[PDB]
């Protein structure tokens, strides 16, 4: 199962 | 220009060390259509070398998103691994986008798994073309260029399957941006720009979701994809 | 390790381009030894197809190719090599038992005392300017200092065939690799990366272009013209 | 003739 980003770069 | 053409095969050779190479062949045809029109020959060569070129247990998801002028809007790719072997892909070029199954032991998840990875894989997408213009302002450079974001992600287990090293690393241009560290706490920064993403994320602590992950969601799924094949 | 045997070979595909075989063989060189104590064979064959490239090599122009090489244990080796029209006339070298500028060329032989102390003395100021720019770099770029590091330096002129000033060039690589270069109008300067625009803001707020364009378009010129004539013969 | 370089990097 694949992560998912929170706070943008 | 060439400049584009070595932002590119930068990116090849860490998709090649990072595991995936359906996004580095991608990613070296692009390279490839450049240089042919460019007609430099170094790069011409460097372009086919790296064309030559393409228990303890892993999985990883690598994650590209490739920007170029004639693009309105990027590609987006996602591959994951699991023991060095494909098991799920997602490409933005695709008819209909969404994960799908590429090994026989991963077609018995059912519509509830598939639906779930392709929201989070559609989440990723807009993450990356935000993340790609916020790049662009800390360098100041220009946007007609090429420009890649890659991104790795997974753990590592010893051999009673225990959780030995959780990473999530980025690249930007191919070179290396940011990482989670294996205290899964702190981040190292890699350049200038990449101070301003570690205040940030320190800030807002954004490591905390990211070490949930690894060593909860993402140990358990590769314990069950482990049994399953 | 691996990453300081690749900032060499980018430092000898610079010192190829800027014209300048013998930085380029010092260079390849110090690439083998070390890749041979790594033992990996890739890196032993990037190394051997490089030294081939090195075996196998109107307008007039005047460069000068200076390099400084940082290595394990002290100082850095500090390099300079003078070319009219692609041809080596003057060079020095700091590994030399009595580093001085000699000449390359025989008529070249003809300049005076005067002329060799004076090009001497700016040889010693460019080394000693080279090691303080290396610290600058390595803590613009937080790198370790026990790596390997490089940086390369081209100056010069083209002429057109009224002998007049076609374009000077002032350009410098670290690494390997693109940092800061004088642009066309000798008044502007275009940063590769983010450390170079510090560079950048430092020199033109001294106004660094001055000085070198002043360069660029006398003493270069009118030394080239010398030796252009010198060379006539 | 060589050039002589001013500020450092």
């Given at each position: 199962?694949?992560?998912?980003?929170?706070?943008?770069? | 220009?060439?400049?584009?053409?070595?932002?590119?095969?930068?990116?090849?050779?860490?998709?090649?060390?990072?595991?995936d190479?359906?996004?580095?062949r991608?990613?070296?045809?692009?390279?490839?259509?450049?240089?042919?029109?460019?007609?430099?020959?170094?790069?011409?060569?460097?372009?086919?070398?790296?064309?030559?070129?393409?228990?303890?247990?892993?999985?990883?998801?690598?994650?590209?998103?490739?920007s170029?002028?004639?693009?309105?809007?990027?590609?987006?790719?996602?591959?994951?691994?699991?023991?060095?072997?494909?098991?799920?892909?997602?490409?933005?070029?695709?008819?209909?986008?969404?994960?799908?199954?590429r090994?026989?032991?991963?077609?018995?998840?059912?519509?509830?798994?598939?639906?779930?990875?392709?929201?989070?894989?559609?989440?990723?997408?807009?993450?990356?073309?935000?993340?790609?213009?916020?790049?662009?302002?800390?360098?100041?450079?220009?946007?007609?260029?090429?420009?890649?974001?890659?991104?790795?992600?997974?753990?590592?287990?010893?051999?009673?399957?225990?959780?030995?090293?959780?990473?999530?690393?980025?690249?930007?241009?191919?070179?290396?941006?940011?990482?989670?560290?294996?205290?899964?706490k702190?981040?190292?920064?890699?350049?200038?720009?990449?101070?301003?993403?570690?205040?940030?994320?320190?800030?807002?602590?954004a490591?905390?979701?990211?070490?949930?992950?690894?060593?909860?969601?993402?140990?358990?799924?590769?314990?069950?994809?482990?049994?399953?094949?």
């Amino acid at each position: 199962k694949a992560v998912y980003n929170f706070a943008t770069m | 220009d060439r400049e584009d053409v070595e932002r590119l095969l930068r990116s090849v050779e860490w998709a090649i060390k990072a595991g995936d190479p359906y996004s580095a062949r991608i990613l070296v045809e692009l390279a490839r259509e450049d240089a042919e029109k460019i007609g430099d020959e170094r790069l011409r060569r460097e372009v086919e070398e790296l064309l030559r070129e393409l228990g303890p247990h892993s999985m990883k998801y690598i994650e590209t998103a490739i920007s170029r002028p004639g693009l309105e809007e990027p590609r987006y790719i996602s591959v994951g691994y699991v023991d060095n072997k494909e098991f799920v892909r997602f490409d933005s070029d695709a008819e209909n986008p969404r994960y799908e199954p590429r090994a026989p032991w991963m077609e018995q998840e059912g519509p509830e798994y598939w639906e779930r990875e392709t929201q989070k894989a559609k989440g990723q997408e807009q993450w990356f073309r935000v993340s790609l213009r916020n790049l662009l302002g800390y360098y100041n450079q220009s946007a007609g260029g090429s420009h890649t974001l890659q991104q790795m992600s997974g753990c590592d287990l010893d051999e009673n399957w225990r959780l030995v090293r959780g990473y999530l690393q980025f690249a930007y241009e191919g070179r290396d941006y940011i990482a989670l560290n294996e205290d899964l706490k702190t981040w190292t920064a890699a350049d200038m720009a990449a101070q301003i993403t570690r205040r940030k994320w320190e800030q807002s602590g954004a490591a905390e979701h990211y070490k949930a992950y690894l060593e909860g969601e993402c140990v358990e799924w590769l314990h069950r994809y482990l049994k399953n094949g």
